[model samples]
Target: AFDGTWKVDRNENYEKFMEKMGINVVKRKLGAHANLKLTITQEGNKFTVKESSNFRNIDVVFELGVDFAYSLADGTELTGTWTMEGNKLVGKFKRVDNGKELIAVREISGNELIQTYTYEGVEAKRIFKKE
Candidate 1:
């Protein structure tokens, strides 16, 4: 169901969650207004994401049960893969810098796409809509 250009519409407690992730205030502020966009294409068990934001632009390609590396705007690295569970895409990742587990899940709800993130007991979510 997630097969379009989605633009971030809003976030919930994202700044505090970033702070809990050890991100600096300046970086958190920048991330809050990052203008993040994601274009996802899925073919069978493989998916590719074209990620773009004010900080950078890149393509993330992966398949189910395959692991790859990804980095955040602040350079936090994560190694993991995404798997499909019913209607949701669940990501299991480990932070390279801190050895912490970060989990994310993507699901489509009505007309919006919801992505939720958890790290070190803090949870945050970003909601996007087709743009």
Candidate 2:
């Protein structure tokens, strides 16, 4: 259901979450204002996401229930899959190095897209608006 250009509107306690994730202070500072943008397209059971931020930009494609690898801007790698649950897109991922689970969910609300993330008992959220 998320297919369009979305720009980050706000964040909630994301820097603290990054710190708990082991990100260095410098990177965490940069990430605080990363200005993330996502352009998503879906076809059938597959989807492609064009992700851009101050750190970098990359295109990622994945199918529902299929595992894939994704790397964070700080170089942490995650192996996971995105699954469709009702109207939400749920991502269940595990850190490759430590095998810690990180979960994310994306859902649309009126004119906003809400993406929530949980890792190591810390939770953070990013809200997006159509651009």
Candidate 3:
């Protein structure tokens, strides 16, 4: 149910959310319309995400409940863990530079895959459709 190629269709409060994250204006201009796509595959406890966006392209691999390191396109570093909570994929990460917390969740709703993010008390969501 969660394995497929999902292309971003729209955003909810993304600009404000990124602003709360301290993203600069210049970057946010492009970041707001990154044209992101995610191709995810799962095997047992491991999941690989083939990520493509206007910012960059990268593949990330991680196992359920295992801690790992990740970096954002803007060079922000993070250490985190992805865990299955109920029917959702929840990621709890902290900035390596500031120790700020970022919570992200991915779930399928109807025909769309919704990814929600929370940081510094701000919430935003990105909705995607199967491609």
Which regions of candidate 3 deviate over 4 angstroms? 9-14, 17-19, 23-31, 66-71, 85-87
lDDT of each: 0.58, 0.57, 0.57
TM-scores of the models, in the order given: 0.72, 0.71, 0.72
Model 2 reaches what TM-score against the true structure?
Answer: 0.71
Q: List the residue pairs that clash in candidate 1.
A: none
Candidate 1's TM-score: 0.72
Candidate 3 lDDT by residue in tens digits, 49-88: 7677776776667767543444454465554766764346
Best by TM-score: 1
- Candidate 2 versus truth, CA RMSD in Å, comes to 3.4
Model 2 over residues 1-131: C-alpha lDDT tens digits?
45666666333434544566455555532235666666566775645576777767765676775445444544554557667643566766665556646566664677587665444555566675775
Error of 1 at 22 (Å): 3.4
On residues 27-46, what C-alpha lDDT tens digit does candidate 1 reach at each position? 54323666766666776664
Q: What is the lDDT of residue 37 in candidate 1?
A: 66
Candidate 3 weakest ten by summed lDDT: 9-18
